[PDB]
UniProtKB/Swiss-Prot annotation, chain C:
Protein name in the entry: Spike protein S2'
Species lineage: Viruses, Riboviria, Orthornavirae, Pisuviricota, Pisoniviricetes
Complete-protein stretch covered: 1017 to 1065 of 1273
Disulfide bonds: C16-C27
Outcome recorded upon mutating T11I: In strain: Gamma/P.1
Domain of life: Viruses
Organism the protein comes from: Severe acute respiratory syndrome coronavirus 2 (2019-nCoV)
Record's function text: Subunit of the fusion protein that is processed upon entry into the host cell. Mediates fusion of the virion and cellular membranes by functioning as a class I viral fusion protein. Contains a viral fusion peptide that is unmasked after S2 cleavage. This cleavage can occur at the cell membrane by host TMPRSS2 or during endocytosis by host CSTL. In either case, this triggers an extensive and irreversible conformational change that leads to fusion of the viral envelope with the cellular cytoplasmic membrane, releasing viral genomic RNA into the host cell cytoplasm.
Length: 937, 168, 49, 49, 49
C-alpha cells in the first residue's frame, strides 16, 4: 500500500530568519508527489534520511529505533515518548525480537510530521485534522552523536514512510518568515522554469532552463597488444644459477614488463619490494631493469635487502640503502641440492662483484637449503597497461594511448598516413583516431547535446508545457522533429497561424482549443493579390482617421555605484589593497557618472524642443476635435488622462539612484507646451514664433500635405472630428486594458533592475575566498593571510563592477540611439508634418501629439488611411483634337460612359476642362491614350 | 539571439499581407523577371540567387525564426506591391495602378513632368531593362560586391574561432 | 552596429521601397524614383532606380 | 600600479628576483596590465560606436 | 605641483575644504564650473558592544 506525498516534506533548512523572499536551496527534502509506503512495526531502510508522518486518534506510536543492527553489538538510538516526557538514549541496547550499557548520551525532555536526517537532526510539525496540504517543519532536537543509521524501526494508527533526496527547492517566505509555498525543481519542466526564473509565476514564452547531454555508457581503453615482452622466463626458470660472490647480471630493456606472474605465483617463498609497491609494478615504468641472479643458503636470504649486514650483505652481494627494486626468492632443494653436497656455490660497495663453498644437500633443514634469488634493480621497461574491447556507434569514454575524451566512435573515410595516429579539425580539435591495435580509422562525433527550452502559455491560463531540445534528434532524448530541434509534447498542426511563441526555423507554438499546445509553420500574413491590368486603377472613395501609439524609451535610471563601498565597505584593510589596482576603482566611478549625465541630456534633447511654455485657452473650440484626454487635467501632477494611464502601467552596498533633472511635472509642462503649440499654432512655434491659426484651417494644410484637397476636410469636417475623437477613446481602452502596451518602457526598467540585482548578488560569492563576507575574513585572519583572502574578493567584485559598467554603457548606447530617434520624431512628426513613410505609423501622416511617460516618451500619431475604394477604368492621357491632354494633378478615370479627372488619394470626379489638363505631345506618341472631349469654358 | 530575429522582422515584415504578381508581365515595357521569384524553383529571383551564391566545446548555433523561404515570401510580397500598387500598399490598401501611371507619379515626384515619361516611355523602359542586366553582370563577376555581408560573416567566424582556440 | 544597420535598412525599405524618398543620396545618386528589395544571406540588398 | 606585485617596475622585479619567484611577480603585473588594456579597448570600441 | 625645474611650487591639502577635495579628485589646481562627486559622507561608530 502506497500514498501520494503531495507537497509535504519541506522544512526550514537552517536557523536563519528570512522574509518576503524567494530563496533557492538544496538539501535532503521529500520529493514532491513521491511514493510513501502506507502502514497500519517492521525495520525499514533509512537511506539518506527519512520522512515520517502519522495520523492518529489514540496516540499509539511512541517512538523510533535507529541504527545498523538494532541488536546490541554497537550503539543504537532510542527515542521514546512515554507518559509525561521523552527519553533519548544512544546505549548498546539489547532489544526484543518484536519491540513496541556503554552510553555516550542521555537526555530527558492528530497529524504529526517528522524529518529524521543526518550528526542527527529532528524536524517536526503538529496540526489538527495522508491529507493534502502544505506546511514547513522546524528543527527541535540536535543530537551530536555521530551514530551510523542505515535502518530504523517504528515503535507502536496509520503512518507513512518516504525518503529524502538532495534536490533543489525554491522556498517562498512570507512577511513573518514562514515558508508558505515551494517549487520542487526536479518535479517537471515547468518547475524547472519557475526555479530558473526564481518565481512562482511564469509569463508566456520560451525559456532555456537546462542543457541536454548524452552520457557515456561504458569506457574503452586501447593500447598496442604487447608486441615486445622481456624474457623473465630466462631469469626465473633458468637451467643454472650463479654463486653469490660472482653472480649473473641480465639486462631487462625495451619491452612490456609483466610482473603479475612473479607477484601472483605461489612458487616463491618470498616476494618483497622496497622502493615501490609490489602491486603497482604493472602501472610503473623504470629506465632500466637489471636481474642479479644467484644461489644462497636459506637463513641468509634475509640479507638480500637494503640496510643489511652479514656475510652476503657485506662481502658478496650488497644493496644500496636507497635501493629501488624487488627481491624474489624460492627454494631449489629439488634442483640445486645434491646428495653428496653441491659445492659449486661460493661466498666470501653496492652491486660490486678467500672464498668458501655451501654444502647444499637435499636432506638438510630448511635454513640450510639453497634458494634461488633474483633481485630486480630498478624509460624502456614499462608495465602492460591493459586494454578492453572497442564498442562502436555508442557514446563512450575513450582512451587511445595518451588521448582521452567522450564521444561516439564510427568508421571514418580519412586516409591517415602510415605514421599518423591522431587527426585534428581546424580549431585544434580531435576529429578521428587510429586504433592502436587494429589499423582502422575511427571518427569521433561529440555526444549529442543542446539547450533545453520550455515552451509555455502563461501560468495564469495553463500549467501544461512542451519541451524543445535544441539541435538534437528524437532518438537520443506526440513528438515533432524540426530543424530547430526535437519538440516533445506539442501537437503537429497543418494549419498556419500568426506566430505567438517562436521555436525557430519557421516554427511557432501556441495554446489553442479542450486546449493544448500546438506547433505549426507560422503564417506571414493573409494571401492576396493586386488586380493589375494596363487600364484599371483603384481609387479610395472613403477614409478613416486612425490613431496609433508609438512608445519609445528615452532614459535609464541614473544609477551610481561607489566602487570602494561596494568592494571594501567600511574596511580600511581592504581599501589599502584596493589601491594596488590604481585607477580601476576610479574608472568605474567615472563611467557611471558619465552615463548619469547622458540620461539628462537624452531627456532634454527629446522634450525641450520648445523654448517657451505654451498653454491652451479656456476656449476648446477646435472645430469639433476633442483633445481633453491628451491635455493636462487642471484639477491635479498636471497630467492628461492618457498620461496617467501610461504611468500607472510601468513599475546599503554602495548602490544608489540619483534623481533626474527634469521631474514628472517638468516633463508634463514640456509636453503641455508642445501640445498647446501643436493644437493652436501648428508647426509655426517649431520654426519660430507661435502663430495662432483656427484648428480647422490648420487641418486643411495637414490634408493638402498628403495629397487631399482642403475642401475634403471642410465638407467632411464633422466626420473627421468624430473619427478622431473615437480613435482617442480607443487608445485609452487599449492602454487601460493591457500593461503589455508599454512593454518597451517596462523592458528598460527590467534590464536595469536585473543588472543591479546581479551586482548585489555577486557580493555573496566567494571567488575562491574562505568567506564572501569581508568582516568574517578580517575577524578570522591576521593581515599576512587575510590580505590573500581579501584580494580574492577584490578581484571578483572589481571584475563584477567592470562587467556591470560595460553592460550599462552598451545598454546606454541603445537608449541614446532611441532618445536620438525620439528627438528626431518629435521635431519632424509633432513640430511639423513628416512625409516619411511609416515614420509616424501607418497611413498618410497628418499630425501627432507627445505624451509624457516613465523613462520615455509616447507619441499619438494621427494618420489618414483609405477605407473604401472602387475599380475605375483609366488612361494616361486623353485625345481631344489629336493633341494629348494630361492632368495637372490626379488621374483620368472612367465610370463606363464618361471620363473625369480626380485626385489620387480621394475619389472626387471633376469635369475635364482646359483648366484641369495641359497639352504636350500628341495621340501618335502616348501609349494607352484614349478618345475624349475636353471642355473649353 | 532574440535581438537578431527582431532585426529581421523590422526590416522585412513591413507588409501586412503577402501579395503575388499576376501571370501577365505587361508593366509598361519594364522587365522585372530577374527580380521576381522564379516559379519553377527555393522561390527566389535570378538576382537573389546571385546574391546568395557569393557569400560563404559547448558552442551551438540556433536557426533564425524567418528562414530563407520566409524572407523570399516577404521580398516577393513587397516587390509585388511595389510593382502593381506602388506606394499605396505601404500606406494602406494595395490599390491597383497601371505601371506607366505609377511611373508618371514617380517622375512628377522628382520635378519632371509626367509627359516626359510617356513620350519617352520606350526609351525609359529600355534603359531600365539594360540597367538590370548590368546588375546581374556586376554581381556575377565581382564577388566583393557583397563584401559587407561576407565581412559580417567573417567577423563572427573569427570571434568563434578565437573563443575555441583559447581553450588550448 | 548590426542593429543600427538593420534599423537603417528598415528605414530605407519603409521610405525608399514602400514610398518615394526625397532624401538626397539616401537611395543612391540621382533623383530617386523607386526601389526593389532583394533577399541576401544575413542581410538585405536594395536595387535603387 | 603594483596589482599585488612587490614592484610596479618590470625591470626591478627581474633585477631583484630569480624566475621561480620573478615569474609570480610578473604574472601579477601581466594580469593587471592585460586587464587595463582590455578595459581601455572596450571603452574605445564603445566610444567609437 | 612640480614646475619645469622639479621644484614644488604649490600644493592642495585634500582635507582642508570641499574645493580642495574637488581639486584633488580632478587632479588639478583649477576647477571648472559644475558639480562634482568627491566623497561619501559616513556616520562613524561611537561605542563598542
Ligand atoms: C471630450 O470628451 C470627454 C470624455 O472623454 C467628455 O467628458 C465627458 O462628458 C460626459 C457628458 O457630460 C460625462 O458624462 C462624462 O463623465 C465626461 N467624462 C469625463 C472623463 O469627464 C467631454 O465633455 C468632451 N468635450 C467636448 C467638447 O466634446
Ligand atoms: C457616369 O457619370 C455621368 C455623370 O454623372 C452619368 O451621367 C448622368 O446620369 C444622371 C442620372 O444618374 C443624369 O441625370 C445626368 O443627366 C447624366 N449626365 C450626363 C452628362 O449624361 C453617367 O450615367 C455615369 N455612368 C455610369 C455607368 O455610372
Ligand atoms: C480617336 O478617334 C479618331 C477618329 O475621330 C481616330 O482616328 C482614326 O483612326 C483610324 C484608324 O487608324 C483611321 O483609319 C481614321 O482615318 C482616323 N480618322 C481621322 C479623322 O484621323 C483616332 O485614332 C482615335 N484615337 C484613339 C486614341 O482612340
Ligand atoms: C526579360 O528579359 C529576359 C532576358 O534577360 C527574357 O528572357 C529571354 O526570352 C527569350 C525569348 O524571347 C529567350 O530566348 C531567352 O533564352 C530568355 N533568357 C532568359 C535569361 O530567360 C524575358 O522573356 C524578358 N521578359 C519580359 C516580360 O520582357
Ligand atoms: C507508487 O507505485 C505504484 C506502483 O507500485 C504506482 O502505480 C503509483 O502510481 C505510484 N504512486 C506515486 C505517487 O508515485
Ligand atoms: C519513561 O521511560 C523511562 C525508562 O527509562 C523512565 O525512566 C521514565 O521515568 C519514564 N517517564 C515517565 C514520565 O514515567
Ligand atoms: C561495553 O564495553 C566493555 C569494555 O569496556 C565491553 O567489555 C562490553 O562488552 C561492552 N558492552 C557490550 C554490550 O558489548
Ligand atoms: C554504516 O554501516 C554500513 C553497513 O550497514 C556501512 O557500509 C557504512 O560504511 C557505515 N557508515 C559509517 C559512516 O560508519
Ligand atoms: C503575521 O502574524 C500576524 C499575527 O498573527 C498576522 O495577523 C499576519 O497576517 C501574519 N502575516 C502573514 C503574512 O501571515
Ligand atoms: C593485435 O592482434 C591482431 C590479431 O588479432 C594483429 O593483426 C595486430 O597487428 C596486433 N596489434 C599489435 C599492435 O600487435
Ligand atoms: C616459469 O615456468 C612456469 C611453468 O611453465 C610458469 O608458470 C611461470 O610463469 C614461469 N615464470 C616466469 C617468470 O615466466
Ligand atoms: C491572473 O491570475 C490572478 C490570480 O493569481 C487573477 O486575479 C487575475 O485576474 C488573472 N488575470 C487574468 C487576465 O486572467
Ligand atoms: C535524425 O534526424 C533526421 C531528420 O533530419 C532523420 O531523418 C533521422 O532518421 C534521424 N536519426 C535517427 C537515428 O533517427
Ligand atoms: C497534413 O495533411 C496531410 C494530408 O494532405 C496528412 O497526411 C498529414 O499527416 C497532415 N499533417 C498534420 C500535421 O496534420
Ligand atoms: C464613410 O463611411 C462612414 C461610415 O463609417 C459614413 O458615415 C461617411 O459618410 C462615409 N463618407 C464618405 C465620404 O463616403
Ligand atoms: C476589382 O476587381 C477585382 C477582380 O474582379 C476584385 O477582386 C476586386 O475586389 C475589385 N475591387 C473593388 C474595389 O471592387
Ligand atoms: C491593354 O491590355 C489589353 C489586353 O491584353 C490589350 O488588348 C490592349 O491593347 C492593351 N492596351 C495597350 C495600350 O497596350
Ligand atoms: C629654472 O632655472 C632657470 C635658471 O637656471 C630659470 O631661469 C628658470 O626660470 C627656472 N624655471 C622654473 C620653472 O623655475
Amino acid at each position: 500500500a502506497y500514498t501520494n506525498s503531495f507537497t509535504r516534506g519541506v522544512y526550514y533548512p537552517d536557523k536563519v530568519f528570512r522574509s518576503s523572499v524567494l530563496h533557492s536551496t538544496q538539501d535532503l527534502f521529500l520529493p514532491f508527489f513521491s511514493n510513501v509506503t502506507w502502514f497500519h512495526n517492521p525495520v525499514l531502510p533509512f537511506n539518506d534520511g527519512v520522512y515520517f508522518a502519522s495520523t492518529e486518534k489514540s496516540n499509539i506510536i511512541r517512538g523510533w529505533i535507529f541504527g545498523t543492527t538494532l541488536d546490541s553489538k554497537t550503539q543504537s538510538l532510542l527515542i521514546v515518548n512515554n507518559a509525561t516526557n521523552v527519553v533519548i538514549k544512544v546505549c548498546e541496547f539489547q532489544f526484543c525480537n518484536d519491540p513496541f550499557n556503554n552510553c555516550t548520551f542521555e537526555y530527558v525532555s492528530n497529524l504529526r510530521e517528522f524529518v529524521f536526517k543526518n550528526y542527527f537532526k529532528i524536524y517536526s510539525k503538529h496540526t489538527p485534522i495522508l491529507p493534502q496540504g502544505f506546511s514547513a517543519l522546524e528543527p527541535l532536537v540536535d543530537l551530536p552523536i555521530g551514530i551510523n543509521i542505515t535502518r530504523f524501526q517504528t515503535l507502536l494508527a496509520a503512518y507513512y514512510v518516504g525518503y529524502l533526496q538532495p534536490r533543489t527547492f525554491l522556498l517562498k517566505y512570507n512577511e513573518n518568515g514562514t515558508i508558505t509555498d515551494a517549487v520542487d525543481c526536479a518535479l517537471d519542466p515547468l518547475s524547472e522554469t519557475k526555479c530558473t526564473l526564481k518565481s512562482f509565476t511564469v509569463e508566456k514564452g520560451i525559456y532555456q532552463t537546462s542543457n541536454f547531454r548524452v552520457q557515456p555508457t561504458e569506457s574503452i581503453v586501447r593500447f598496442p597488444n604487447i608486441t615486445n615482452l622481456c624474457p623473465f622466463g630466462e631469469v626465473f626458470n633458468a637451467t643454472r644459477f650463479a654463486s653469490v660472490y660472482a653472480w649473473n647480471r641480465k639486462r631487462i630493456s625495451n619491452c612490456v614488463a609483466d610482473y603479475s606472474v612473479l607477484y601472483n605465483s605461489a612458487s616463491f617463498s618470498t616476494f618483497k619490494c622496497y622502493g615501490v609497491s609490489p602491486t603497482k609494478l604493472n602501472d610503473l615504468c623504470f629506465t632500466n631493469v637489471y636481474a642479479d641472479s644467484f644461489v644462497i643458503r636459506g637463513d641468509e636470504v634475509r640479507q638480500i635487502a637494503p640496510g643489511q649486514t652479514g656475510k652476503i650483505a657485506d662481502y658478496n652481494y650488497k644493496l644500496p640503502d636507497d635501493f629501488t627494486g624487488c627481491v624474489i626468492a624460492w627454494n631449489s632443494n629439488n634442483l640445486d641440492s645434491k646428495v653428496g653436497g653441491n659445492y659449486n656455490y661460493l661466498y666470501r660497495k653496492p652491486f660490486e662483484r678467500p672464498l668458501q663453498s655451501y654444502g647444499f644437500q637435499p636432506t638438510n633443514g630448511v635454513g640450510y637449503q639453497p634458494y634461488r634469488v633474483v633481485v630486480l634493480s630498478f624509460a624502456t621497461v614499462c608495465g602492460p597497461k591493459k586494454s578492453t574491447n572497442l564498442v562502436k556507434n555508442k557514446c563512450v569514454n575513450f582512451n587511445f594511448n595518451g588521448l582521452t575524451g567522450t564521444g561516439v566512435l564510427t568508421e571514418s573515410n580519412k586516409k591517415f598516413l602510415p605514421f599518423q595516429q591522431f587527426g585534428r579539425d581546424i580549431a585544434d580539435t580531435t576529429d578521428a583516431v587510429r586504433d592502436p591495435q587494429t589499423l582502422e580509422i575511427l571518427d569521433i562525433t561529440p555526444c549529442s547535446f543542446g539547450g533545453v527550452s520550455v515552451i509555455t502559455p502563461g501560468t495564469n491560463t495553463s500549467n501544461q508545457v512542451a519541451v524543445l531540445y535544441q539541435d538534437v534528434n528524437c532518438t537520443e532524448v506526440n513528438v515533432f522533429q524540426t530543424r530547430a530541434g526535437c519538440l516533445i509534447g506539442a501537437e503537429h498542426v497543418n494549419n498556419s497561424y500568426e506566430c505567438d511563441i517562436p521555436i525557430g526555423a519557421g516554427i511557432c507554438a501556441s495554446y489553442q482549443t479542450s486546449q493544448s499546445i500546438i506547433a505549426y509553420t507560422m503564417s506571414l500574413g493573409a494571401e492576396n493579390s493586386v488586380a493589375y491590368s494596363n487600364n484599371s486603377i483603384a481609387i479610395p472613395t472613403n477614409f478613416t482617421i486612425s490613431v496609433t501609439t508609438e512608445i519609445l524609451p528615452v532614459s535609464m535610471t541614473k544609477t551610481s555605484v561607489d566602487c570602494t563601498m561596494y568592494i571594501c565597505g567600511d574596511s580600511t584593510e581592504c581599501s589599502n589593497l584596493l589601491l594596488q589596482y590604481g585607477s580601476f576603482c576610479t574608472q568605474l566611478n567615472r563611467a557611471l557618472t558619465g552615463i548619469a549625465v547622458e540620461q539628462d541630456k537624452n531627456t532634454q534633447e527629446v522634450f525641450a524642443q520648445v523654448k517657451q511654455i505654451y498653454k491652451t485657452p479656456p476656449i476648446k473650440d477646435f472645430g469639433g476635435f476633442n483633445f481633453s484626454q491628451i491635455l493636462p487635467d487642471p484639477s491635479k501632477s498636471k497630467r492628461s488622462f492618457i498620461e496617467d494611464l501610461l504611468f500607472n502601467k510601468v513599475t546599503f552596498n554602495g548602490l544608489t539612484v540619483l534623481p533626474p533633472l527634469l521631474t514628472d511635472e517638468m516633463i508634463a509642462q514640456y509636453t503641455s507646451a508642445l501640445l498647446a503649440g501643436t493644437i493652436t499654432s501648428g508647426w509655426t512655434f517649431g520654426a519660430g514664433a507661435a502663430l495662432q491659426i483656427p484648428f480647422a484651417m490648420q487641418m486643411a494644410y495637414r490634408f493638402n500635405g498628403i495629397g487631399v484637397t482642403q475642401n475634403v476636410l471642410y465638407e467632411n469636417q464633422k466626420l473627421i472630428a468624430n473619427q478622431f475623437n473615437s480613435a482617442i477613446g480607443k487608445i485609452q481602452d487599449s492602454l487601460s486594458s493591457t500593461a503589455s502596451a508599454l512593454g518597451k518602457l517596462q523592458d528598460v526598467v527590467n534590464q536595469n533592475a536585473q543588472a543591479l540585482n546581479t551586482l548585489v548578488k555577486q557580493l555573496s560569492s566567494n571567488f575562491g575566498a574562505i568567506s564572501s563576507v569581508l568582516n568574517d575574513i578580517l575577524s578570522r585572519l591576521d593581515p599576512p593571510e587575510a590580505e590573500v583572502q581579501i584580494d580574492r574578493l577584490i578581484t571578483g567584485r572589481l571584475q563584477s563592477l567592470q562587467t556591470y559598467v560595460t553592460q550599462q554603457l552598451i545598454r546606454a548606447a541603445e537608449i541614446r540611439a532611441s532618445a536620438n530617434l525620439a528627438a528626431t520624431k518629435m521635431s519632424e512628426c509633432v513640430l511639423g508634418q513628416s512625409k516619411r513613410v511609416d515614420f509616424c505609423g501607418k497611413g498618410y501622416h497628418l499630425m501627432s501629439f507627445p505624451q509624457s511617460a516613465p523613462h520615455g516618451v509616447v507619441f499619438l500619431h494621427v494618420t489618414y488611411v483609405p477605407a473604401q475604394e472602387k475599380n475605375f477604368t483609366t488612361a494616361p492621357a486623353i485625345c481631344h483634337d489629336g493633341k494629348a491632354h494630361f492632368p495637372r494633378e490626379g488621374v483620368f478615370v472612367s465610370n463606363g460612359t464618361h471620363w473625369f479627372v480626380t485626385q489620387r488619394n480621394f475619389y472626387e470626379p471633376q469635369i475635364i476642362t482646359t483648366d484641369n489638363t495641359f497639352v504636350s505631345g500628341n495621340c501618335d506618341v502616348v501609349i494607352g491614350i484614349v478618345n475624349n472631349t475636353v471642355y473649353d469654358p
